[PDB]
């Protein structure tokens, strides 16, 4: 309902979503090729930006747009 979506999309059960995984997630809703937005959003969504966003980072990031 909130963060479960991040772990839900991770069919690989890795609890980590990289830049590619992110772009794909949104791609499942439509077709929007954003190279700039992907890069920026990638580092933004990722708390540590370590290759991919971990469940923990995503959870703490979710709703942290205050």
Swiss-Prot record:
Disruption phenotype: RNAi-mediated knockdown causes a severe reduction in fluid-phase endocytosis and phagocytosis. Also, recruitment of actin to phagocytic cups is impaired. Calcium-binding protein which probably acts as a calcium sensor and modulator, contributing to cellular Ca(2+)-mediated signaling. Activates endogenous kinase(s) in a Ca(2+)-dependent manner. Plays a role in regulating actin cytoskeleton dynamics. Regulates the association of actin filaments in a bundle but not actin polymerization and/or nucleation processes. Required for host cell phagocytosis and macropinocytosis. Ca(2+) 1 binds at residues 10, 12, 14, 16, 21. Transmembrane segments: none annotated. Ca(2+) 2 binds at residues 46, 48, 50, 52, 57. This is Calcium-binding protein 1. It comes from the Eukaryota. The N-terminal domain (EF-hands 1 and 2) is required for localization to the phagocytic cup, G-actin binding and activation of kinases. The C-terminal domain (EF-hands 3 and 4) is required for G-actin binding but is dispensable for localization to the phagocytic cup and activation of kinases. The chain holds residues 1 to 66 of 134 of the full protein. The lineage of its organism: Eukaryota, Amoebozoa, Evosea, Archamoebae, Mastigamoebida. It is found in: Cytoplasm; Cell projection, Phagocytic cup; Cell projection, Pseudopodium. Residues 1-32, 33-66 form the EF-hand domain. Homotrimer (via EF-hands 1 and 2); oligomerization is required for its function. Interacts with G-actin in a Ca(2+)-dependent manner. Interacts with F-actin in a Ca(2+)-dependent manner.
